[PDB]
């Protein structure tokens, strides 16, 4: 019944491509993220589409092994997670670099002006790099300061550890090391569930788009907050969604282990 396996692989590829393209469109075209992408280039879309693909793959990863072909699909899903995590990490490295360069006076004037938001009590920041520290020390400080940065570093390290310790040789001839170090998936999922708790990547609020009109106020950056047509924009980030995708498989695997 190789037809079923081929159909499953093709459906998986189609779903991954569809999710990537759809979320790229979501985070690239709409004017809600107009200022966000004005600050982050296309790195915004390139970091938030692999996020959706990673939610999908992290939902899929644990199902094959929950006994109560399949291991091949598990390996393919793990490698897809690795690929999408690589794209996500590279895009967010670009985001961190540009954000830190903008916070200090080392970027284009419009990006710097956008970065000034949030310094007052009644302002919501767009540039999540708040401390005015130069590079590369600024990016390193963000990595260990932001909850997203810390959790991302931890889960990425455990991901490389799992991948490198799940190689064929270690898995056939040193199954003890493989099995003992494979339980880093616990840390992986614990970090991934709280990864987006802070909501640092922010798009313009839903209501702020009504009072603040993008095409009327794009080039009035300096006058925001002191002319009627251009109230200072308010930004807000999405709530954490990956826990919704990951909780199901975690519960199923926990039930399976309890059965074992």
């Amino acid at each position, epitope marked *: 019944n190789e037809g079923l396996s081929i159909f499953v692989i093709l459906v998986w590829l189609g779903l991954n491509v569809f999710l990537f393209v759809w979320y790229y469109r979501v985070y690239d075209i709409p004017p809600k993220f107009f200022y966000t992408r004005k600050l982050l280039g296309s790195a915004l879309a390139l970091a938030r589409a692999p996020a959706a693909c990673l939610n999908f793959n992290c939902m899929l990863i644990l199902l094959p092994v929950c006994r109560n072909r399949n291991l091949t699909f598990h390996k393919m899903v793990a490698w897809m997670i690795a690929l999408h995590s690589a794209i996500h990490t590279i895009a967010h490295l670009f985001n961190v670099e540009w954000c830190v360069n903008a916070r200090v006076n080392n970027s284009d004037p419009y990006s710097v002006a956008l970065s000034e938001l949030g310094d007052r009590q009644n302002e919501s920041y767009l540039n999540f790099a708040r401390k005015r520290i130069k590079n590369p020390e600024g990016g390193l400080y963000l990595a260990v300061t932001l909850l997203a940065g810390i959790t991302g570093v931890v889960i990425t390290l455990c991901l490389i550890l799992i991948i490198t310790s799940s190689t064929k040789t270690i898995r056939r001839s040193y199954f003890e090391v493989f099995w003992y170090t494979h339980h880093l998936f616990v840390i992986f999922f614990i970090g991934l569930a709280i990864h987006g708790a802070e909501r640092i990547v922010r798009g313009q609020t839903a209501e702020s788009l009504a009072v603040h009109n993008i095409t009327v106020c794009e080039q009035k950056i300096s*006058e925001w907050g002191k002319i009627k047509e251009c109230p200072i924009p308010q930004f807000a980030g999405n709530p954490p969604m990956t826990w919704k995708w990951i909780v199901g498989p975690m519960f199923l695997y926990l039930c399976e282990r309890l059965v074992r």
Partner: antibody, heavy 119, light 110 residues
Framework: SLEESGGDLVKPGASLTLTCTAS?????????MCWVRQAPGKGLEWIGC???????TYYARWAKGRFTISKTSSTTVTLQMTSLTAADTATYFC???????????????WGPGTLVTVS | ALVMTQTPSSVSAAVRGTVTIKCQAS??????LAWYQQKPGQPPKLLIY???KLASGVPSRFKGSGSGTDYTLTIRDLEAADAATYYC????????????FGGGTKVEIK
């Protein structure tokens, strides 16, 4: 500096265009370019403004329907008046609303002004 | 609509005296105000561009102040060359406003 061309005796109900040509200033930054008129012996009356970059144009409520301000070139801005009446006789100033660093605006540069007579 | 009213339509003060010109907004303009001095037969000269921020070349004699709807202009050591007319312009609201300039105040030297 700025200077307003045009401005001549005009029969009521006709149309006239005042051209504001700069010398040393380019209308391509983020500052506006407003038109202000002052009837003989009266206070200043604001007509409208034209952002240099966006192109958005604002007019006073009385001038919205019959005054057109357009940035024809990088140094010349034109105000077109239609359905002129005797009440539109006044000295028309061309002023640059310089958006200073803090974000607060002020009509930094003013033109000498051109008399317009409607009768 | 937003209308500015300059209550002291005509104020007189002797040389080295002080003159207070009040320009109150009908609506809360967020300190975006400008004070111009227009000598007869001359384009107005900007004095204050912020609510109280002096313009280039304008001495500290011309003080702006106030916040919200009430703003003031003051002249510490009024000279003989200050016999001009002073206007206040609000840049906050330009959508629906009959006139940005707040009427006009004529300053006389005693």
């Amino acid at each position: 500096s700025l200077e307003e061309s045009g401005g001549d005796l005009v029969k009521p109900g006709a149309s006239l265009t005042l051209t504001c040509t700069a010398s040393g200033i380019d209308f391509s930054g983020y500052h506006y370019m407003c038109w202000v008129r002052q009837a003989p012996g009266k206070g200043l009356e604001w007509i409208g403004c034209t952002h240099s970059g966006d192109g958005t144009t604002y007019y006073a409520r009385w001038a919205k329907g019959r005054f057109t301000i357009s940035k024809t070139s990088s140094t010349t801005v034109t105000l077109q008046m239609t359905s002129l009446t005797a009440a539109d006789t006044a000295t028309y100033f061309c002023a640059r609303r310089y958006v200073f660093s803090g974000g607060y605006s002020g009509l930094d540069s003013w033109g000498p002004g051109t008399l317009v007579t409607v009768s | 609509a937003l209308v500015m009213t300059q209550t002291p339509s005509s104020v007189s003060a002797a040389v080295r005296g002080t003159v207070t010109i009040k320009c109150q907004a009908s609506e809360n303009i967020y300190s975006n105000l400008a004070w111009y001095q227009q000598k007869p037969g001359q384009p107005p000269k900007l004095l204050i561009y912020g609510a109280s921020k002096l313009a280039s070349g304008v001495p500290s004699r011309f003080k702006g102040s106030g916040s919200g709807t009430d703003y003031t202009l003051t002249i510490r050591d009024l000279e003989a060359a200050d016999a001009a007319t002073y206007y206040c312009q609000q840049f906050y609201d330009s959508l629906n406003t009959d006139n940005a300039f707040g009427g006009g105040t004529k300053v006389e030297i005693k």
